[PDB]
């Protein structure tokens, strides 16, 4: 019930058909009207953490609510574990201070336990993390958690469904009227 919002959905369908894919996602992000779950899934799967966070930023901030807090924490925790698994402690300690320290103030003992992982030979020595397989398996299990959190978050609840539109909607509307 907003022309600005109706136009965004019409434009998003034109861009998709035109295959201007980067523009599709920038419009979703910058407008905030539609969160593409299919896009987010692919991005999490390919470990493109910078784009995952930039995209999320168009819909939520890290401290907006408890769901938003856990979404960002889960992603940074995975980014961290992956640096540990590749035996890159300088990178893992860089992620801990720059990305995970923000949540230390909330659960302090959790942060201490996550920090302790840097000293283990293999982080699977920790009871909770013994079940972590490879990075492909880990990303899949976290994505299932991420998906639950987005669906249960009030800031995202009304932004997961794209309207049912006839193909070339914007093409057919401008052609008839611009005459």
Swiss-Prot record:
Residue span(s) of domain LisH: 3-35
Superkingdom, natural source: Eukaryota
Domain CTLH: 33-91
Subcellular location: Nucleus
Coiled coil regions in record: none
Other facts noted in the record for this chain: The tpl-1 gain-of-function allele is suppressed by mutations in the histone acetyltransferase HAG1 gene. The tpl-1 gain-of-function allele suppresses developmental defects in IAA12/BDL mutants.
Domain text: The N-terminal TOPLESS domain (TPD) (1-209) binds directly to a 12-amino acid LxLxL EAR motif peptide.
The protein, known as: Protein TOPLESS
UniProt source species: Arabidopsis thaliana
Lineage: Eukaryota, Viridiplantae, Streptophyta, Embryophyta, Tracheophyta
Originating gene: TPL
